[PDB]
Amino acid sequence: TTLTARPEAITFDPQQSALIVVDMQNAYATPGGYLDLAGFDVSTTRPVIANIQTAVTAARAAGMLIIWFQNGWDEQYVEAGGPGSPNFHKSNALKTMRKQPQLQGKLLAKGSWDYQLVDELVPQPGDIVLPKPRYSGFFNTPLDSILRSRGIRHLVFTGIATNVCVESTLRDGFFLEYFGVVLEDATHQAGPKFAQKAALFNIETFFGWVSDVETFCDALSP
Amino acid sequence: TTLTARPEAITFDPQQSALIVVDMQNAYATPGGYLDLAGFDVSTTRPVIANIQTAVTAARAAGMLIIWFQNGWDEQYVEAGGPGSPNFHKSNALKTMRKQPQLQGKLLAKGSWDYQLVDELVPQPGDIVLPKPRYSGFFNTPLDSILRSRGIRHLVFTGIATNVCVESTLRDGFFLEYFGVVLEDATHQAGPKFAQKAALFNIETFFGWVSDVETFCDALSP
């Protein structure tokens, strides 16, 4: 399949490709979730959910593996690292709970509403649902092994946040020799709008390719 | 030692830290080098070079290990990966040489002027000079081993490009549990100025800390 993209069109085989849905949890996409409580704007993520539903339907019907990521930790945050880990000091979820103690245990905690995939996005049999303890899906996980075991070399990225978990996973994919394509209208940034523009610029210019959901779905039709 | 930084000050032991000078080669810093020929603005790097000189002098006097990265490949580009590698398709150096065959074998080529560190920056005995074949200094290199062997947990980053090799190495450092600081006035982006602002925003907000050369040097002065 040829897929129109920036900076140029690319070729991939859907049977040797994977659609990655990054962290489409209430924490990242739903009012009252972690990102909203931490002061990030989540008022614009509703269209992202619908676009991911469309991309997922197309990808699955074309024989692409669907991988869903859930970012987060045990309710006691052992998996987040203690003060000896930079994640303890950088995590805005941990920072939010140190500021608002009534939140403690509620954000990015396995078994919590915050941690669940949003109600609209339901993994199907044959999909893979992967937890991850840090922003990049390629550290501390079996993601690379899962992809290699299926001979997958092309990754189609969707999800939140474009500049954080999405871009980090795509960048690390590039260093592991994966060809990464981000569907720009199926992503949303954490931060001001320039963080979306800059993430896509960095991907298009240095690390991978940028397309969109409709173009992706049209390319998969045959 | 305390280092004033954004979003807050951090503490570290300079003798358990490293100053990383990312890719201060003519390719990235000098008119007529790779980035300039590829269409990126390199006209404002003279203050970056001077500031890196100041930071290196302070770090070495404080007992901090200095690591210099040189990015590039053999002059036949075997190390850049063939058409089976995304690096072959993304590399702007390779793209430039495809358009300009006069430059074939010169950009980012070991032994060449483009690959040499800029004239002003001269590694000293005791420093480590590390070649790397991809943007991130943590993939395909002994960098992690070098740092662990010395018990180093804090990395102070300088160099080019802020949004590419610098940020990628810092992000990967974070995933390997290193505490990363970038000295903003000792870096320069590849792309429009929004790429500098966004790289610093992503680092400060999610991955590490942002400081500057004079603050860094004053922290080491005791």
Ligand SMILES: NC(=O)NCCC(=O)O
């Ligand atoms: N911004 C940047 O690091 N470009 C280098 C990419 C290449 O190796 O061609």
